[PDB]
Amino acid sequence: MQIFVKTLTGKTITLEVEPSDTIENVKAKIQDKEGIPPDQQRLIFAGKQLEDGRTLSDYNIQKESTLHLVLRLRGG
Amino acid sequence: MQIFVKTLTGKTITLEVEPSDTIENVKAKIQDKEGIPPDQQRLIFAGRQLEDGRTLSDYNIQKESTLHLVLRLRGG
Amino acid sequence: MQIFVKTLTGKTITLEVEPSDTIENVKAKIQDKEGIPPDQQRLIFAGKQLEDGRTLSDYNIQKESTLHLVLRLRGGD
Amino acid sequence: XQYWXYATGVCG
């Protein structure tokens, strides 16, 4: 399916994903186009903070959903 | 008078207020129009987090000032 | 060398620094221009909070890098 | 949502 991620700048990127994709897999896709390390990304869906180790299907994210990408600070 | 409240999706809520309205009162107006409980709301103006018992004029919030609404992120 | 700092109101200020300057020195630089007490300054570079006792070079901050001042929210989750 | 900077929340 496709989904969309909105960044800080107002950029919207489209990702091709599968419901079995983890949050980590999606953050890797985002790194691949916007340079942000997975440990400095937090993805938000309908105001909910998504967590590593869960899949898009766990959160019932289905086609053309929008995620909001937020900065996460790296520990030390 | 009117004030604006910017939200994470980029949307702008417009509120009719008076200078003597408290920060509590502004979070209550947001709840009435948007459905967001006041305890989930943090308001930011001029680089500072607004405290519940101040008035708008205490913070020099003026006609057509904009605040930033930053919600608590939800689990699950 | 110069570096830049973006304040909580989105103004960008310029600092003259040397890589061996401590974060604490940098915060005193900021105060000398904007009035922000170091006590209330929290700086980030490249997604990392800067510790007062470390140097700019410890964080790889270069000429014309931009730091951001950040606000810790009261009662954040 | 622990932090804020001009003009966006930040997690940290």
Residue numbers in the entry:
A (entry chain B), B (entry chain C): 1 to 76
C (entry chain A): 1 to 77
D (entry chain 1): 1 to 12
The study reports:
Ubiquitin (Ub) is a small, 76-residue protein that acts as a post-translational modification of proteins in eukaryotic cells, resulting in diverse signaling pathways. In particular, polyUb chains linked via K48 have been extensively studied in their function as the primary signal targeting proteins for proteasomal degradation. In particular, the focus has been on K48-linked tetra-Ub (Ub4) and longer chains shown to be an efficient proteasome-targeting signal, although recent evidence suggests that shorter chains as well as branched chains containing more than one linkage type have some role in this function as well. As such, Nawatha et al. had developed de novo cyclic peptides capable of selectively binding K48-linked tetra-Ub chains with nanomolar affinities and protecting them from deubiquitinases (DUBs) and the proteasome.
The crystals contained two molecules of Ub3 and two molecules of Ub4a in the asymmetric unit. The three Ub units within each trimer form a ring-like arrangement and are mutually related by ~120˚ rotation around the axis passing through the ring’s center. The hole at the center of the Ub3 ring is occupied by Ub4a. Despite the small size of Ub4a, its interactions with Ub3 are quite extensive (surface of the interface between the two entities, calculated with the PISA Server41, is ~800 Å2), resulting from the fact that Ub4a occupies the central hole in Ub3 and has comparable interactions with all three Ub units. Ub3 is tightly wrapped around the peptide, with all three Ubs oriented such that their hydrophobic patch residues are buried within the complex and facing the peptide. While they are naturally described here in the context of the complex, it is possible that some or many of them exist (stably or transiently) even in free, un-complexed, cyclic peptide. In particular, H-bonds between UbA and UbC (G75A—R72C and R74A—Q49C) and those between the C terminus of UbA and Ub4a (L71A—Trp4, L73A—Gln2, as well as D77A—Gln2) appear to lock the Ub3 ring with the cyclic peptide being held inside it. These interactions highlight the involvement of the tail of the proximal Ub in the peptide binding and explain the selection of the proximal Ub trimer moiety by the peptide.
